[PDB]
Ligand binder design. Structure first.
Ligand SMILES: *[C@@H]1O[C@H](CO)[C@@H](O)[C@H](O)[C@H]1NC(C)=O
Ligand SMILES: *[C@@H]1O[C@H](CO)[C@@H](O)[C@H](O)[C@H]1NC(C)=O
Lengths: 176, 15, 187
């Protein structure tokens, strides 16, 4: 078992993130805007507690160490490493029972991302769920994007992911 | 008593 | 252009909370620059950009023991706080055997055995035909994190079903007291 507390601040976009991870799984993440801890699983809040306000304290240190190093490294930009999109399903497809489309983005940096689910071309926010950026031993990033859907025979879904380091917005088609 | 999770804090770098 | 700073405090539990290894990593733009390794006890710079920091943080004794106590203050503490819903999480795998192709009475077929929902990742998914353990042609995907604290795995068996034989996918996982099995007689 390995528990890892990860946090980052992306200088241009002024975006940041605080999170805890256990064996490749998010325990929770602090919602900067609302200063509230957002557990991966609701049952987690019931067994333990974390003080979200400390997260915002820490990011203040990151932002600082960020501005320092950015200068100490003569403003070298990060090399955009493109993502490995992959659309799969929560479980096997059966026409009656409803399923969950999973769009996994892997091995990329910087954290800025832009996923979209398109049902027959048009985007479907009807049920969309997602995670924040998760860490990897090679210190790159993972990220999941969900779309609960009802197995059909006429709908075609594509997960359209965009990334600075990515020529065109790569779509990743799927269909029963 | 709901247990609490402790966070470590990143040391500030010098300038 | 972008610029990123990213910190990481890591708690490595070897055999429960017997031995622990705290690691305080500092990374700028994909490059790790400094790090506090519990097994070392002092800040060590990985790159020459992160040496001014380790150098300083090392002079400050207050900073040192501060990080040094984290193997207990934070590592062992958080383990015991979360061990319940994480270390002891067990979720039932859902086995489903099915042919990937609606092939003729006898032709080159792939029998997909999709094991889903389980947790932890540790698992065994064996293929059998009429009693014999078909080792010669499995085509697994391996563990696949679904992001919602549950894994899945598709271990196919490339086999030409003879019209008069049954295929079985016996699954064994820590969450179960006995193996979950699914038999699949040739269509
Ligand atoms: C900063 O950039 C300049 C040119 O862009 C380069 O010559 C220099 O080596 C870089 N950093 C330092 C410390 O010189
Ligand atoms: C992704 O970011 C771009 C800005 O670079 C924005 O215009 C676009 O609408 C975003 N995509 C989505 C799906 O939000």
């Amino acid at each position: 078992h390995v528990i890892i507390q990860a946090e980052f601040y992306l200088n241009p976009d002024q975006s940041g993130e605080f999170m805890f991870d256990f064996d490749g799984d998010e325990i929770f993440h602090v919602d900067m805007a609302k200063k509230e801890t957002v557990w991966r699983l609701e049952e987690f809040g019931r067994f333990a507690s974390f003080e979200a306000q400390g997260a915002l304290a820490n990011i203040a240190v990151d932002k600082a160490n960020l501005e320092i190093m950015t200068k100490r490294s003569n403003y070298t930009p990060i090399t955009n490493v493109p993502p490995e999109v992959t659309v799969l399903t929560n479980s096997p497809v059966e026409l009656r029972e409803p399923n969950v489309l999973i769009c996994f983005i892997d091995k990329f940096t910087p954290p800025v991302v832009n996923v979209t689910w398109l049902r027959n071309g048009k985007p479907v926010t009807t049920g969309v769920s997602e995670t924040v950026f998760l860490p990897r031993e090679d210190h790159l990033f993972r990220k999941f994007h969900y779309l609960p859907f009802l197995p059909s025979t006429e709908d075609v879904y594509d997960c359209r992911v965009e990334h600075w380091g990515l020529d065109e917005p790569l779509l990743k088609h799927w269909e029963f | 008593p709901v247990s609490k999770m402790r966070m470590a804090t990143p040391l500030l770098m010098q300038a | 252009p972008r610029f990123l700073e990213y910190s990481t405090s890591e708690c490595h539990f070897f055999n429960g909370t017997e031995r622990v290894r705290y690691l305080d990593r500092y990374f700028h733009n994909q490059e790790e620059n400094v790090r506090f390794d519990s097994d070392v006890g002092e800040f060590r710079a990985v790159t020459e950009l992160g040496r001014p920091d380790a150098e300083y943080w090392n002079s400050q004794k207050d900073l040192l023991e501060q990080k040094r106590g984290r193997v207990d203050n934070y590592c062992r503490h958080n383990y015991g706080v979360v061990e319940s819903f994480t270390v002891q999480r067990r979720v039932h795998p859902k086995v489903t055997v099915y042919p990937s192709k609606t092939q003729p009475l006898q032709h080159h077929n792939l029998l997909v055995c999709s094991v889903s929902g389980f947790y932890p990742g540790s698992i065994e998914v064996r293929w059998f035909r009429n009693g014999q353990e078909e080792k010669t042609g499995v085509v697994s995907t391996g563990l696949i994190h679904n992001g919602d604290w549950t894994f899945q795995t598709l271990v196919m068996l490339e086999t030409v079903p003879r019209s008069g034989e049954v295929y079985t996918c016996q699954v064994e996982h820590p969450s179960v007291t006995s193996p979950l099995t699914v038999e699949w007689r040739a269509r």
